[PDB]
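Record format v2
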Amino acid sequence: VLQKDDKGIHHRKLKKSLIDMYSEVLDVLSDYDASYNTQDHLPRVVVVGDQ
Amino acid sequence: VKEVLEDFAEDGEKKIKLLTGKRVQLAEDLKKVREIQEKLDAFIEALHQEK
């Protein structure tokens, strides 16, 4: 129902930006195993700093 | 003998005078079937979203 707002033609391809799809990739790895032992498999960007 | 074998080189029929030619035909068929499937694989990947 949300995608129907976009009205994306079936024949066009490239339905979603690659990184938006990689977000699902990282999310599924996190869901399968949230431990760092499985996080280590794919790239991430960590934002860390002083309080 | 070198001259006669050159005449052998010239004529392909003189190579398949005895009809045991499975070797050459089978090799050609293997290579061409691999090309067939290689192109069909990309075509079907285009069917999955390129429609």
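Helices of chain A lie at 3-6, 18-32, 36-39.
Chain A touches chain B at residues 10-11, 13, 15 (CB under 8 Å).
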